[PDB]
Amino acid sequence: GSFTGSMPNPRVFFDMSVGGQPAGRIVMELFADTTPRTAENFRALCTGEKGTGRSGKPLHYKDSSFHRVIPGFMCQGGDFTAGNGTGGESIYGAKFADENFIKKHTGPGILSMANAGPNTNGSQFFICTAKTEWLDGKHVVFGQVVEGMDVVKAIEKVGSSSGRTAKKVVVEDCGQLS
C-alpha cells in the first residue's frame, strides 16, 4: 500500500540532435487531468506500447524530422507516417469532441494541438516559444515545457521564414521519463 500504483504525473522527453552531433535534451510535462487522453497519444506513440502494426507500420516517433520551423512564431512538427498531411494515424481513429481548454498559454514553452476546426483531434501540433497576440483564438493546451529552452532556441536560430531548418534536425530517440 505504500505505492498507490497510479501515475497521474506522466513525463515525456525527446532527444534532438543537429547535423551529426548531439544538441541537448528536451523534457515536457503532460497533464493527466484536464487533458489526459492527449498525453496518451504522445506517450503511446513515443514508448510504442501499442506495438508495430502487423501490416508493417512502426508506431514510433524515433528518427523523425520537424516538417517546418519558424522563429518567434512557432515550430510545426509532422507525423512520422509522412508529415505531408496524407499520413498521420491515431489510435483514436474517429475524431472526438475537443475537451474544454480552461487553461491557456500564459507564457512561452506551451504545447498545443493544432485544430483547423472545433471537435478535431488535431493530428498536427505546434510549439509557441514566444508570446503572440495575432494568434489569439480557439486553442487547446495539453502540456507545458519544463526544460530544453536552451536547445529550442537552437532550432529557431537555424530556422527561417522559409520554414526550413539550416541544419538537419532529427530525434535520436523518444520515450517516457516516468
Domain limits, the chain: 1-178
Experimentally, the structure was elucidated by NMR
Catalytic residue among 105, 135, 144, 176: 135
Is 76 marked active-site? yes
| Structural element, H or E, at residue 127 | strand 125-128
Residue keyed to cell 522559409? 162
Is 45 marked active-site? no
Catalytic residue among 67, 68, 105, 176: 68
Catalytic residue among 59, 80, 111, 115: 115
CB atoms within 10 A of CB 109: 18
In one-letter notation, the amino acid at residue 49 is E
Taking the mean position of all CA atoms in its chain, how far away is CA 8?
19
**Candidate CATH numbers 3.30.420.40, 2.40.100.10, 2.60.40.10, 2.40.50.100; the one for domain 1-178:** 2.40.100.10
Closest CA to 77 of 152, 3, 6, 11: 152
Which grid cell is 70?
Answer: 519558424
